[PDB]
């Protein structure tokens, strides 16, 4: 009984690089406040 | 059905020199009153009874020092309606008590709502996507968090920003001394968004202007463009190669590039607003506890963090008596923090 | 511990730069 | 175009300048007199140079009550002799 | 009891209705006079 | 494929899997409440409701159980200090357990609705397409909300069939769960009248019942249906988000200013009670009444309840914390042990002096002592070489009345200055700083954290309303504008009415 | 300094010693970067608003543009038609070349002024000084917001480099 | 050919009329002595 | 220095959980045809 | 689609997708309730704000 | 009457000189009377 | 208050002067839109 609404998901390589850069930079920014 | 509602709709949406629309019924009076209140107040109205300050051209202030100042701290968060229990319908007392400040801030708030409704309204008539309205949520988040939420968390409107050039400068310095606001990572993200937005603005403008196609014979290249032409006016391919070889990376998708230019400043302003929401409650990023523990015990430990707190301490002690006159601070000379000689 | 954490995060970013420049998706004209 | 008359048309028309060579100076002079007669001070409640303080006092007449603020200002204004 | 501020509240209510009423009165009027041609 | 920020749009046309996703969300939220309550119960110290109440201990959901009548543990204690009580099943533990069990049942329901997604109920009987009649759903759900609203006020809050709610005196000294009668007069709109809370729920519930019946029986006008896109489920999301951020701003405001539903014994004092010396005035009034009635200074102050003195202390002011100063207030100044007594300062002339209290704005504050008329009589100087007001020069001493130092007087400058530093914080307490390795830096209370999270979420949800509102009204151009847009529609003059092609 | 908190230290002492906030070149610099950020979001939102429909709703609109394609990807006439009505027709650009020149010029000129502010306050030509500029009929000082700024600046001045000055004037 | 009193006419004068009045008021202020 | 020791795991999960999310999505995009 | 006993019971409650009332319908009545609601919010706001002060309504903890 | 009579460049020049007169008056006021520090 | 009349008088005379110079066309504009 296959659901017709399924759709493939994509993340291209540039989006991976942009996303990893955002997370790493956010971590570099907030880490000092986490260690306090 | 062509009743009065539809006939009114016809008239509001006429293609005139100044489009009006339904949004205009809210936008135009509130914008006009907020602006006229600011001009009226900075020209004629004092801050003597609320702040102990002169603040109008009438009193001798100049464009940098005039303000419409906040009400006295004793008003709390009162709406300060002209017909309310404080002014009691007395226009002159209302002005002396700070009624123009809430007048400007409240009509300004509703004016901003009206402008954003105008962006939605015009976008729907012309047939474009409403991303300009969406981007305008950032100035609204800033205005609401700084001029409304922040004082609402504090003791009264008095601590909101006053509407003036030098008054806003005092607000910047108050935030350094009391809140250590430069240390706040939500402000840092805001700075990144504003400076990065200015960066993108300069670099995209310069890049377009320096990858133009020769589409005319004159040395002024502006003329060689036609609004209805189908071709790109500059070379995306040459621009892409330039930045890939100068910087390592470059844009290759022009739709992504312009979404990004929306994204960066809009997100930055939104982040700064969140931090100000924290400051409404004094929920500051004031200290690093680890630094304080070390510095308390080790009088040779010094960093730019400890140096900056000493500055904040100077700001608080030297500006508080004049800046908060209702508190009646009397700080004798001997208690004032001072370095050697100065 | 905190010094290791800061330097590690920094080092990952410099590695990310290398891949984003030299192992990017090539822009292809059409 | 939206149908209104071009601005460049209007402001180079003698009739515009016949009308506004009067209306503009008349408004300017009304503004001057609003100040020169001292009326602006009394409309907005702004101190004159000689009414910030009483002759020997150096305290600000600062408002300190919410609902008696009107009376507080009137009291401060009386004490100017 | 009608306190002074409750009186002031009613005055604010009447003032705003008056302002909104004249605004729409004038607007409806003008829209009826200057109709669009279809 | 779908970009990552759109994966959840696959539910827009699939009501059964929408219900499954909504069931999974409800299971997660119920499981969070159960597990948060269990965590709080494993760390809560019930042994001192006077100087170590829940709000000093970082408790967040415990006050919400107590507010509506859950006050006891199966292990025999209650939050008001009683021992040997039997709460029945509805203890803190029984409430947490009930939420955990509910979480698991909703999880099972979610799996059923995910697998059996193609139910005939979700199909339009005429077209066979998936379809939800949102106008009638609204009336059904509003009708259920009104009944529930009404029964909450009529039975739970009144005590008719239920426990009532937490109520206290104006100084937060004697709080407990009490049946509350509705207030039907204009004071029912006073935020501090618990009676208005009862009346609101009975009256708004009846209105919701009536409005629910209306919305079940009367279809939307064609003009509202078209204008608000009532066939598009995303219009409900847009207006629902707007109602939710409206609500979030209101609960942040009533938490910060105080109201009958945010009592100080559950969430801590407000900042404004320090701004106006609310507790200090009540303390002084009681001491005047004793002194006037013949008691000595030591009897007058010893009669002050420790709980009342503890409110008159800036360490319990929620405006003294910091964004990254984490944990309970006890982690800052320590676990309060005892009132030290009221410090009285005198100079060598025997005049009484009063320490200027710290305003909430200042991380630090100088030490300045005045007479009753506000004249500076002593201070702790920064530069010593031209000090005239030093404690040494002015012969400042401190005497304690009430509390553990009752009857003692100190005259050595260092000890007197020590207590003067503490006196800028209000009443002076003994703290255990060792048990938690407290660091001596103030933290905010649950009142502060609740307010901050809800103001931030409210503001962010404003962007959600704008975004989903825009998607509803501009669905047709979501992928771009018409490739055949005529320049004449967007150039000036061609149409008399903007965007209306019939007005060339 | 080459650090985050060191930058703030530099900024605060700068304000104490030059009143940079009251200097028109820093004010022009603020207009440059506030304006640059405004025009950035402006240009981004208008182009994004007028993208030509080339994709379905389940895909990123970014796939509607292809690197190197000859034809423009948005309708500048529709963008100008929206923004001209938002304000008035003659406050809107329809020449993409002069629009992009404006985006280049505004922040660059502003930051030039900011740079020249720091460079000329290097030689102690400082911000406007209105300390005690307003005087009443008797000669009492009437404070303005400028005098409140001065109070804050004094606190910064007397505390910075707290062990470094032996003589009463901080002349460099 | 053109009308005289339009919406644009009103918008122009609600701004321009007070501006001139204020400029005259501020010009007068330059001659006030303490 | 007396840092908060939860800072370590807080920073580590902050980097790891969202980074891993992105890697999963990327790799299953490449493996499609 | 799959039929169930409960689905058949609830069927009438999801059968009128798209059914509207002609024209403006009850909009003018809606507008009246919206206006009354606006005035209600203004009243409770201004009471909390101490801009509207009523006899025997003391906006303070001292009302217990 | 008919727009065109008075050339725009003379209008621009007269309006410009009026601006300079009024702004110069304001800078004069910074050194005299109120707000002059004297 | 006489200062009120001294101030409004230059404005009132300006209103009347512009009406003299515009009333022929004003009536003609109102007539056309009827
Ligand atoms: C997004 C897009 C939006 C677009 C813009 C929309 C513009 C709309 C304009 C709305 C303006 C709202 C004005 C709110 C004024 C206010 O709040 O005024 C405040 C009053 C409460 O008054 C204050 O109350 C305080 C506490 O007093 C109490 O406690 C005292 C001391 O113990 C005494 O006991 C006293 O009697 C008792 O009243 C102090 O008295 C203060 O001086 C007094 O100002 O609340 C009230 O009117 C009502 C409080 C309940 C509702 C609050 C919800 C709205 C605000 C949310 C912001 C959250 C802020 C929290 C910080 C973050
Ligand atoms: C058209 C847009 C608009 C909007 C949104 C506002 C909004 C505001 N004005 Mg502004 N104002 C406007 C135009 C507008 N104004 C205009 C054109 C003028 C020039 C006259 C002013 C002059 C002005 C002054 C002098 C003041 C304000 C103030 C305010 C604030 C309080 C208003 C209030 O409480 O009214 C409440 C009234 C309503 C909400 C009207 C609604 C009527 C309902 C819907 C109908 C039912 C009423 C019923 C028929 C009457 C029953 C009465 C009976 C029981 C006795 C609010 C921000 C006050 C302020 O800013 O405080 C600092 C203030 O003092 N305004
Ligand atoms: C409404 C939400 C809410 C509120 C108000 C509280 C309140 C409280 N919690 Mg609770 N808690 C919650 C939800 C909440 N909690 C949830 C969902 C969980 C499960 C994770 C918990 C689990 C929990 C534990 C285990 C503990 C608490 C504790 C506490 C107390 C101390 C809080 C503290 O120190 O925070 C500190 C808060 C911060 C440092 C704020 C973080 C700011 C974030 C990281 C910013 C992120 C920015 C982001 C990356 C930027 C994106 C940018 C991009 C979009 C461009 C306080 C009473 C403590 C306690 O005392 O118990 C007795 C405690 O031990 N809570
Ligand atoms: C009742 C609330 C609600 C519901 C049922 C929805 C539903 C939706 N949103 Mg909306 N939205 C909301 C509130 C809501 N939203 C709010 C408050 C905002 C402002 C922040 C938005 C801003 C927004 C934008 C900008 C967009 C959507 C989109 C969507 C659609 C796709 C979402 C998706 O696949 O994300 C996938 C998300 C992930 C895979 C990971 C997100 C991780 C987040 C950022 C951090 C983790 C949050 C944490 C786990 C939970 C915290 C809960 C919090 C409440 C405490 C979907 C219809 C998208 C759309 O319209 O598609 C056409 C879209 O572009 N929403
Ligand atoms: C101080 C910085 C700053 C100013 C002065 C500013 C100004 C403006 N921004 C606008 C738009 C925008 N700004 C945008 C993004 C940004 N804007 C930014 C920052 C600013 N934006 C930043 C940093 C961003 C990046 C996110 C966008 C996307 C837009 C627009 O689409 C829109 C535009 O059309 O630009 C071309 C225009 C809105 C016109 C309007 O609302 O009329 C109505 C007037 C009203 C409602 C009166 C408001 C009254 C205010 C709120 C309070 C009173 C203020 C006093 C009158 C003056 C006080 C002055 C003292 C403080 C010195 C206006 C030119
Ligand atoms: C699944 C993913 C799970 C991990 C994801 C990544 C985790 C990143 C870390 C995020 C939180 C960082 C916590 C601070 C560091 C720390 O260790 O705290 C540690 C603290 C715990 O506090 C500890 O308590 C102990 C006794 O109980 C001791 O006192 C310790 O000293 C004390 O540190 O963590 C918390 O309690 C916070 C819990 C959540 C509170 C949230 C309230 C405010 C939320 C509003 C935020 C909205 C912002 C939106 C902006 C857009
Ligand atoms: C202090 C609080 C007060 C509360 C509010 C009270 C005032 C209401 C606020 C809104 C007022 C707006 C007035 C502006 C309308 C206008 O000037 O039109 C001017 C119209 C149309 O002019 C026409 O101009 C038309 C073009 S256009 O519409 O002006 O663009 C053109 O089509 C037509 O041929 C020409 O005759 O002519 C009139 O005589 C209007 C009659 C007014 C009754
Ligand atoms: C002429 C004086 C200019 C002085 C400042 C320089 C402004 C222009 C430089 C910005 C560089 C941006 C990046 C390059 C962007 C770029 O590549 O430019 C390209 C753009 C168009 O180039 P063209 O080749 O078409 O024309 C330039 C020459 O080739 C001659 O035709 O250049 C210009 O428009 C020059 C305009 C000169 C006239 C401008 C006068 C502006 C003065 C306005 C007053 C400002 C005072 C403010 C006080 C607060
Ligand atoms: C408040 C109020 C109100 C209102 C009022 C109004 C509305 C007003 C308006 C007003 C106005 C509307 C005013 C205006 C003014 C203006 C001015 C004052 C201007 C000036 C200018 C100048 C000075 C310029 C300069 C310059 C520049 C800027 C740049 C370029 C060059 C030059 C140099 C030229 C009412 C009654 C309702 C009520 C009560 C309250
Ligand atoms: C199956 C079953 C069962 C069981 C169940 C269970 C066991 C459950 C559990 C559940 C649970 C246990 C749940 C939980 C949940 C949780 C959650 C859901 C959380 C979340 C969180 C969050 C979301 C957070 C966030 C954040 C962070 C992290 C940081 C800060 C900021 C914020 C706040 C944002 C039973 C036997 C009954 C029976 C039937 C079957
Ligand atoms: C608030 C505005 C709600 C519209 S109200 C609507 O207006 C029509 C005019 O087209 C009338 O014909 C109709 O009777 C009336 O109900
Ligand atoms: C599914 C396992 C959960 C079992 C929980 C049974 C607790 S039941 C609970 O027990 C208490 C004993 O002190 C009594 O005070 C209370 O009356 C009773 O309801
Ligand atoms: C010189 C030290 C002894 C004099 C009394 C000091 C003020 S009192 C002292 O304050 C500490 C916080 O600083 C608390 O932890 C402690 O419980 C309390 O006794
Ligand atoms: O080095 Mn760095 O800071 Ca320029 O002032 Mn002098 O010196 Mn020091 O004092 Mn201030
Ligand atoms: Ca004199
Ligand atoms: Cl320094
Ligand atoms: Cl020296
Ligand atoms: Fe561009
Ligand atoms: Mg002068």
CATH homologous superfamily title of the domain at 271-448 in chain F? Photosystem II CP47 reaction center protein
Number of β-strand runs of chain C: 0
As a percent range, the share of strand residues of chain C is under 5%
Helical residues, percent of chain C:
over 70%
Query: Termini distance of chain F?
Result: 42 Å
Coarse morphology of chain F: elongated
Strand portion of chain F, in percent? Answer: 5-15%
Distance between the termini of chain C: 51 Å
Give the oligomeric state: part of a larger assembly
Lumenal side (chain A): 30-36
Organism (chain A): Thermostichus vulcanus
Subcellular location (chain A): Cellular thylakoid membrane
Cytoplasmic side (chain A): 1-13
Protein architecture, described:
Chain E: This is Photosystem II reaction center protein X. Chain E: It holds the Pfam family PsbX. Chain E: Residues 29-38 are cytoplasmic. This is part of a larger assembly, with twelve protein chains of twelve kinds. In chain D, 54% of the residues lie in helices and 0% in strands. Chain D has 81 residues and is an all-alpha fold. Chain D has one domain (5-81): Up-down Bundle (Single alpha-helices involved in coiled-coils or other helix-helix interfaces). Chain D starts with 6 loop residues before the first helix and ends with a helix. Chain G is an all-alpha fold and 172 residues long. Chain G has five helices and no strands. Chain L is built from one helix and no strands. The interface between B and G is large, with 110 and 103 residues. The structure holds digalactosyl diacyl glycerol (dgdg), chlorophyll A (CLA) (3 copies), pheophytin A, 1,2-distearoyl-monogalactosyl-diglyceride, the ligand CCCCCCCCCCCCCCCC(=O)OC[C@H](CO[C@@H]1O[C@H](CS(=O)(=O)O)[C@@H](O)[C@H](O)[C@H]1O)OC(=O)CCCCCCCCCCCCCCC, 1,2-dipalmitoyl-phosphatidyl-glycerole and 7 more. 1,2-distearoyl-monogalactosyl-diglyceride sits between chains F (58, 326-328, 331, 449, 453, 456) and I (4, 6-7, 10, 13-14, 17).
Secondary structure elements and pairings:
This is part of a larger assembly, with 12 protein chains of 12 kinds.
Chain C (H helix, E strand, L loop, with lengths): L1 H21 L8
Chain E lengths: L3 H30 L5
Chain I lengths: L5 H25 L3
The structure holds digalactosyl diacyl glycerol (dgdg), chlorophyll A (3 copies), pheophytin A (PHO), 1,2-distearoyl-monogalactosyl-diglyceride (LMG), the ligand CCCCCCCCCCCCCCCC(=O)OC[C@H](CO[C@@H]1O[C@H](CS(=O)(=O)O)[C@@H](O)[C@H](O)[C@H]1O)OC(=O)CCCCCCCCCCCCCCC, 1,2-dipalmitoyl-phosphatidyl-glycerole and 7 more.
The site of one chloride ion has 3 residues of chain G, from loops.
Task: Offer a concise description of the structure.
This is part of a larger assembly, with 12 protein chains of 12 kinds. Chain H has 34 residues and is mostly helical. Chain H contains 1 helix and no strands.
């Amino acid at each position: 009984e296959p659901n017709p609404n399924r759709q493939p998901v994509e993340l291209n390589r540039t989006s991976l690089y942009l996303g990893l850069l955002l997370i790493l930079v956010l971590a570099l920014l907030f880490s000092s406040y986490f260690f306090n | 059905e062509r009743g009065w509602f539809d006939i009114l709709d016809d008239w509001l949406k006429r293609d005139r020199f100044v489009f009006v629309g339904w949004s205009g019924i809210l936008l135009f009076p509130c914008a006009y009153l907020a602006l006229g209140g600011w001009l009226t107040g900075t020209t004629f109205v004092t801050s003597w009874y609320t702040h102990g300050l002169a603040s109008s051209y009438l009193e001798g202030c100049n464009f940098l020092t005039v303000a419409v100042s906040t009400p006295a701290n004793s008003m709390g968060h009162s709406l300060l309606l002209l017909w309310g229990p404080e002014a009691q319908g007395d226009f002159t007392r209302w002005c002396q008590l700070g009624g123009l400040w809430t007048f400007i801030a409240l009509h300004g708030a509703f004016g901003l709502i009206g402008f954003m409704l105008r962006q939605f309204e015009i976008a729907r008539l012309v047939g474009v996507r409403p991303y300009n309205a969406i981007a305008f949520s950032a100035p609204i988040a800033v205005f609401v968090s700084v001029f409304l939420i922040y004082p609402l968390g504090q003791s009264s409107w008095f601590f909101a920003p006053s509407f003036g050039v030098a008054a806003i400068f005092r607000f910047l310095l108050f935030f350094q001394g009391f809140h250590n606001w430069t240390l706040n990572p939500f402000h840092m993200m805001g700075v990144a968004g504003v400076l990065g937005g200015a960066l993108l603005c300069a670099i995209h403008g310069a890049t377009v202007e320096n990858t133009l196609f020769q589409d005319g014979e004159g040395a002024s290249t502006f003329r060689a463009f036609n609004p209805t032409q189908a071709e790109e006016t500059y070379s995306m391919v040459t621009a892409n190669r330039f930045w890939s070889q100068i910087f390592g990376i470059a844009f290759s998708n022009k739709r992504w590039l312009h979404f990004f230019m929306l994204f960066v400043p809009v997100t930055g302003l939104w982040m700064s607003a969140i931090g100000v929401v924290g400051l409404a409650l004094n929920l500051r990023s004031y200290d690093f506890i680890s630094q304080e523990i070390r510095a308390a015990e080790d009088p040779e430990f010094e960093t730019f963090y400890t140096k900056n707190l000493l500055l904040n301490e100077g700001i608080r002690a030297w500006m508080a008596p004049q800046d908060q006159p209702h508190e009646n601070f009397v700080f004798p000379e001997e208690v004032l923090p001072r370095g050697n000689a100065l | 511990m905190e010094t290791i954490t800061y330097v590690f995060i920094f080092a990952c970013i410099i590695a990310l730069f290398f891949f984003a420049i030299f192992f990017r998706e090539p822009p292809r004209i059409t | 175009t939206t149908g209104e008359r071009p601005f460049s048309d209007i402001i180079t028309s003698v009739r515009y300048w016949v009308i506004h060579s009067i209306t503009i100076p008349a408004l300017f002079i009304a503004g001057w007199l609003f100040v020169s007669t001292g009326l602006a001070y009394d409309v907005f409640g702004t101190p004159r140079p000689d009414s910030y303080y009483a002759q020997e006092q150096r305290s600000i007449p600062l408002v300190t009550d919410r609902f008696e603020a009107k009376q507080q200002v009137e009291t401060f204004l009386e004490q100017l002799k | 009891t009608i306190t002074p501020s409750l009186k002031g509240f009613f005055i604010g209510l009447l003032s705003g209705a008056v302002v909104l009423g004249l605004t729409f009165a004038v607007l409806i009027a003008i829209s009826q006079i200057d109709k669009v041609q279809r | 494929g779908l970009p990552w920020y759109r994966v959840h749009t696959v539910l827009i046309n699939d009501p059964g899997r929408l219900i499954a996703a909504h069931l999974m969300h409800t299971a997660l939220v119920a499981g969070w409440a159960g597990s948060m309550a269990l965590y709080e119960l494993a760390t809560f110290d019930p042994s001192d409701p006077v100087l170590n109440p829940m709000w000093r201990q970082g408790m967040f959901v415990l006050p919400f159980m107590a507010r509506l009548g859950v006050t006891g543990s199966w292990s025999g204690w209650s939050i008001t200090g009683e021992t040997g009580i039997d709460p029945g099943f509805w203890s803190f533990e029984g409430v947490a357990l009930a939420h955990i069990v509910l979480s698991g049942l909703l999880f099972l329901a979610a799996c059923w609705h995910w697998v059996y997604w193609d139910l005939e109920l979700f199909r339009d009987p005429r077209t066979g397409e998936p379809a939800l009649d949102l106008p009638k759903m609204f009336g059904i759900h509003l009708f259920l909300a009104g009944l529930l609203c009404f029964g909450f006020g009529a039975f739970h809050l009144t005590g008719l069939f239920g426990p009532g709610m937490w109520v206290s005196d104006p100084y937060g000294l004697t709080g407990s769960v009490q049946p509350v009668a509705p207030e039907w007069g204009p004071d029912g709109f006073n935020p501090y009248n618990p009676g208005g809370v009862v009346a609101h729920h009975i009256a708004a519930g009846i209105v919701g019942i009536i409005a629910g019946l209306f919305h079940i029986l009367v279809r939307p006008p064609q003009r509202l249906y078209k204008a608000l896109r009532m066939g598009n489920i995303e219009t409900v999301l847009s207006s629902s988000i707007a109602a939710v951020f409206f609500a979030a701003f209101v609960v942040a405001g009533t938490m910060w200013y105080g109201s009958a539903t945010t009592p100080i014994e559950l969430f801590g004092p407000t900042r404004y009670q320090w701004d106006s010396s609310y507790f200090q005035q009540e303390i002084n009034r009681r001491v005047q009444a004793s002194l006037a009635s013949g008691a000595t200074l030591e009897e007058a102050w010893s009669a002050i309840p420790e709980k009342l003195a503890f409110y008159d202390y800036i360490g319990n002011n929620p405006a003294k914390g910091g964004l990254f100063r984490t944990g309970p207030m006890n982690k800052g100044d320590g676990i309060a042990q005892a009132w030290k007594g009221h410090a009285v300062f005198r100079n060598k002339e025997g005049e009484e002096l009063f320490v200027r209290r710290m305003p909430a704005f200042f991380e630090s504050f100088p030490v300045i002592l005045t007479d009753k008329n506000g004249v500076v009589k002593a201070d702790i100087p920064f530069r010593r070489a031209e000090s005239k007001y030093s404690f040494e020069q002015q012969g400042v001493t401190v005497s304690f009345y009430g509390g553990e130092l009752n009857g003692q007087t100190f005259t050595d400058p260092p000890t007197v200055k020590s207590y003067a530093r503490k006196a800028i914080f209000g009443e002076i307490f003994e703290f255990d700083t060792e048990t938690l390795n407290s660091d001596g830096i103030f933290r905010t209370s649950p009142r502060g954290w609740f307010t901050f999270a809800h103001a931030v979420f409210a503001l962010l949800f404003f962007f959600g309303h704008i975004w989903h509102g825009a998607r509803t009204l501009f669905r047709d151009v979501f992928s771009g504008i018409d490739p055949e847009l005529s320049p004449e529609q967007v150039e000036w003059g061609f149409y008399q009415k903007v965007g209306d092609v019939t007005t060339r | 300094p080459l650090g985050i908190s060191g930058t703030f230290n530099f900024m605060i002492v700068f304000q104490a010693e030059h009143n940079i906030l009251m200097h028109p070149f820093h004010q022009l610099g603020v207009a440059g970067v506030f304006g640059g950020a405004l025009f950035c979001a402006m240009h981004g939102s208008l182009v994004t608003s007028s993208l030509i429909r080339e994709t379905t709703e389940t895909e990123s609109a970014n796939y509607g543009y292809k690197f190197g394609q000859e034809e423009e990807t948005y309708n500048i006439v529709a963008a100008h038609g929206y923004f001209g009505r938002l304000i008035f027709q003659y406050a809107s650009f329809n020449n993409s070349r002069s629009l992009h020149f404006f985006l280049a010029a505004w922040p660059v000129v502003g930051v030039w002024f900011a740079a020249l502010g720091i460079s000329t306050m290097a030689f102690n030509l400082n911000g406007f000084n209105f300390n005690h500029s307003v005087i009443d009929a008797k000669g009492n000082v009437i404070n303005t917001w400028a005098d409140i700024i001065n109070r804050a600046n004094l606190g910064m001045e007397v505390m910075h480099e707290r062990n470094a000055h032996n003589f009463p004037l901080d002349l460099a | 050919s053109y009308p005289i009193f339009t919406v644009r006419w009103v918008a122009v004068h609600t701004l321009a009329v007070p501006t001139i009045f204020f400029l005259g008021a501020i010009a007068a202020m330059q001659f006030i002595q303490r | 220095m007396e840092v908060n020791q939860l800072g370590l795991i807080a920073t580590a999960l902050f980097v790891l959980v969202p980074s891993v999310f992105l890697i999963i999505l990327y790799v299953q995009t490449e493996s499609q045809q | 689609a799959r039929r169930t006993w409960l689905g058949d019971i609830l069927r009438p409650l999801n059968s009128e997708y798209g059914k509207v009332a002609p024209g403006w319908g009850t909009t003018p009545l809606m507008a009246v309730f919206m206006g009354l609601f606006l005035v209600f919010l203004l009243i409770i706001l201004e009471i909390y704000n101490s801009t509207l002060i009523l006899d025997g309504v003391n906006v303070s903890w001292k009302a217990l | 009457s008919e727009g065109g009579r008075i050339p725009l460049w003379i209008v621009a020049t007269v309006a410009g000189m009026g601006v300079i007169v009024i702004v110069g008056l304001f800078f004069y006021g910074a050194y005299a009377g109120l707000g002059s520090s004297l | 208050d006489w200062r009120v009349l001294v101030v409004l008088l230059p404005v009132l005379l300006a209103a009347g002067w512009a009406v003299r110079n515009i009333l022929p066309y004003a009536v003609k504009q109102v007539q056309k839109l009827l």
